[PDB]
Design a protein around this ligand. Structure first.
Ligand SMILES: Nc1ncnc2c1ncn2[C@H]1C[C@H](O)[C@@H](COP(=O)(O)OP(=O)(O)OP(=O)(O)O)O1
Ligand SMILES: [Mg+2]
Ligand SMILES: [Mg+2]
Length: 280
């Protein structure tokens, strides 16, 4: 009764693309409002209308409402993280400047330190989805493929979705122009994916043990081992520090390729020829 008074929520309530979400440790997993199952962002019949989302919110005790964004709906979702201080005022200049150029429906995200802006328009095709900043804030832009939590906490009385040109987002987002994740999932299923270093562990000794495993699974493809290492819990700034005409990471990967003798062949699937045992 309270949130349906907002003009922007009425615009969103025309679409049967509503979900509910709940806190799993420190993530916001979306759920089907009708049966409580886990909701996909590509299955339309896993969603519901706003009345079903509000009923399921009470049925399963979820944390709040959500809205799945699709290519067909005219909405763009702008996510601004860690831009509000304790008093829920903007403390980041990039976020302040963005709100002055994109005056649409703005609400305070569930954690209270962020903002959501919902606009009607088209994203520029040359910007990254996520852009991080030095102070810790971030900017996520999505027009489809994922959902957004809905709180209804209107910020600065901006309670109406406007149709704005979004080419100005190029001033804030960074520009952008077997598979890697296939190898990662393979190593994870074999217990070859390391965990974050505990205190008292020799991190560089963990780097070499993991680089040794990468040399096998990646077939000693050093450019692939490097791309995978940067996504691993062992990545740090030392990986790119210069060390005697090279980087610590390049030297670590080249020593692993020399130390390791056998390789994993995707055609042969010689998973048993791995010389290293899984982690604990
Ligand atoms: N684990 C997940 N799986 C699928 N979708 C997710 C997941 N976590 C978040 N989302 C969606 C809904 C969020 O609104 C959107 C932005 O992520 P996030 O900024 O981390 O949460 P939030 O914007 O809902 O509140 P806050 O930023 O204040 O914590 O992405
Ligand atoms: Mg956020
Ligand atoms: Mg859309």
């Amino acid at each position: 009764h309270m949130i349906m008074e907002i003009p922007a929520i009425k615009a969103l309530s025309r679409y049967a693309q509503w979900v509910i979400w709940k806190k799993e440790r420190d993530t916001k997993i979306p759920y089907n409002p009708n049966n409580g199952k886990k909701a996909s962002s590509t299955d339309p019949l896993a969603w519901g209308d706003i009345d079903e989302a509000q009923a399921g919110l009470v049925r399963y005790g979820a944390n709040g409402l959500g809205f799945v964004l699709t290519k067909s709906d005219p909405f763009v979702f702008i996510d601004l993280d860690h831009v509000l201080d304790e008093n829920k005022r903007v403390k980041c200049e990039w976020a302040r400047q963005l709100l002055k150029e994109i005056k649409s429906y703005t609400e305070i995200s569930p954690s209270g330190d962020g903002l959501h802006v919902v606009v009607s328009g088209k994203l520029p095709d040359y910007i990254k989805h996520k852009t991080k900043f030095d102070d810790g804030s971030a900017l996520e832009v999505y027009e489809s493929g994922r959902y957004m939590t809905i709180t209804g906490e209107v910020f600065d009385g901006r309670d109406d979705i406007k149709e704005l040109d979004l080419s100005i987002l190029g001033e804030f987002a960074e520009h952008k122009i077997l598979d890697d994740e296939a190898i990662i999932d393979l190593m994870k299923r074999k217990g070859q994916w390391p965990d974050a270093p505990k205190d008292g562990d020799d991190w560089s000794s963990l780097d070499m043990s993991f680089a040794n495993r990468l040399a096998f699974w990646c077939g000693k493809d050093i450019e692939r081992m490097d791309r995978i290492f940067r996504q691993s819990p062992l990545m740090r700034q030392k990986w790119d520090r210069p060390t005697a005409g090279s980087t610590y990471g390049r030297i670590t990967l080249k020593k692993a390729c020399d130390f390791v003798d056998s390789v994993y062949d995707p055609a042969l699937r010689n998973e048993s020829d791995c010389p290293f045992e899984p982690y604990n």
